[PDB]
Amino acid sequence: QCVNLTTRTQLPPAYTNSFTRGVYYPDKVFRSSVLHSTQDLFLPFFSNVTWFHAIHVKRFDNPVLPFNDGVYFASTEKSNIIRGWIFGTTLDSKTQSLLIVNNATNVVIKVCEFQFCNDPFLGVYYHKNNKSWMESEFRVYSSANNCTFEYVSQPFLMDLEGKQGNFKNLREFVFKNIDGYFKIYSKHTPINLVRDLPQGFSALEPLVDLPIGINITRFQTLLALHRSYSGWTAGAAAYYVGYLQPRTFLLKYNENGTITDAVD
C-alpha cells in the first residue's frame, strides 16, 4: 500500500559551491609521491551542485533527477534521514529498477522490476507495547516482478559516530554506470560546523562493483519517516547532488599513498 503524500513546496534549487570535492581513486593500485594524471568522470572543481533539502519550516519534496553520466552525492547528517536510493530509468512501468538501500545493519542491493508510486519513503514504526522499531514497511515498490539480482553486505552508510562537539558526519558518494558495471565510491569526513560543502579534499573509497548492465536515467534518493499518530512525517535532512562529466585531473600522491590535493 502507498498513498499520495506529496505536500510538495516549489522553490528554486539553491546552487552552491563544493570547493574541490568529488575526486576518488581512479585505480586499485598503491602509488606514493607521484603526480599521476588520469582521465575519468569527475566532478569539476568550484562547480554548481544542487542543494536539495525537503525539511524544516511539513515541507516534503523528493523529485526524480536524471542520472546524467555521473552522480555525486553528499549528506551532512544529523538524525539518519537519507537511507538509500532507487536508481533506474522509468521508476515504474515494465522496466528494470535498482533499489540500493542501507538498513540498520546491512546493505541490500536489488536489481529488480519494481513498480513505484510517486512518493517513496521508508517507514519505521515504533510501538508503545513492544518498543521495537521495525522496517517492516514497503511503500517505495508495491510488489516485485521477475526479480533478477540480490546482494546483502555491510552497509555503505556507516554511523562512525561517538565523538562529541561540533564535527558533523558528511557522507559523500559517487555513482557511475559505465559499460555494465555499477561502481559506488564513498568517504566520510568530520566537518567543524560548516553550512556548506567543506573547503578541503576528499578520497572516496571503492565500495561495490555491481554487475548490473542496465540503462538507468532517473536516479532518486530514498528517505526514512517515522509513523506518528500530516501523517507519516518526521526528521531533519539536507543533501547535495552534483553531476560528473568526462574530465581530466592530475592527482598528487602523498607519502602515505593517499592523495593530498587534486589540480583540475
Epitope: 538524525s79 539518519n80 540498520a104 555491510q154 565523538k163
Partner: antibody
Framework: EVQLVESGGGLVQPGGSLRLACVAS????????MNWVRQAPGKGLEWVSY????????YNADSVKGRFTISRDNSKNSFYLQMNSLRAEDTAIYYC????????????????????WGQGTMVTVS | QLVLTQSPSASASLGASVNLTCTLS???????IAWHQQQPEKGPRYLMS???????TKGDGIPDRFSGSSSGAERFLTISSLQSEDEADYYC?????????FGGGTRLTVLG
Amino acid sequence: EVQLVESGGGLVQPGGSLRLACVASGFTFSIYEMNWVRQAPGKGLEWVSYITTSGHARYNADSVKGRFTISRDNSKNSFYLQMNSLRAEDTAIYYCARPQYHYYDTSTYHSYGFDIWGQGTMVTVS
Amino acid sequence: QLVLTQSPSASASLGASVNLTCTLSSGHNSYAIAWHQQQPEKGPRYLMSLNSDGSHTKGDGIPDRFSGSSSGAERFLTISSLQSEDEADYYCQTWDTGIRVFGGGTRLTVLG
C-alpha cells in the same frame, strides 16, 4: 522489558580461554550497539570493548592488552564477548550495559551513555 | 583524556546542600557528561546526561533534588536537602572517538 543477563564464569590461570555471554530480550538488537565495562573488585568501572550495529569492533581503552574480542549474534538475538586469553586482572564483575543511542533516534546526541545496566557476572580468575 | 579532581572525602550535615565537581581536561572544554551513582554492593544507576547548558534528561526515581550545572571546562552536580540515601559512589563519565573514559569515583562521607 529491557534486560541484560549474562553467563560464562570460570576459574583459570592467566592465558586461559572461556565463553562469555550477555544475553538480552525485550528490545531490538538490530538498532542498538552494545558496550562492555569492567569493574575490578573494589575498583572503578572501566570500559574494554564494544561492537557497532553494522558489525565493526573497537578493542580500545588500552587496558585490554590484545586479550579481549567482541562480537554479536543478531540471528539468535544474543550478545557475546568473544572470549579467550583470560589473565590475572580479569577477576571482576562484567556488567554489560546498553547505550542510549539506538539507530532510529531523534533529538541531540546526548546518548551512547548507558541508560540501563546488566546485573553483572563474577568471573573469578587467578 | 579528562581527569577527575574529585575530592576523596567531602561531607556536610544531612538536610544541607553540597555541590560535587567534575573537572575536565582543557582539550575538551565543551564536552558533555553523564552521571552514574554507584550505591555500595549494587549496580550503577544513571541520573542525568548533562549538557553544557545544564539541561536535564532524567532517569527513574530521581527527584528534582539532583540537578546539574556547567561553567567553563568543569561541571557540577547539585544536591539539596540531603537525606540518608546519598551515601554512595558517584562516577562522572564522557564520550570520545570510541572512548568512554568513565573517570573515577566520588566517595562521599556525608556526616549525619
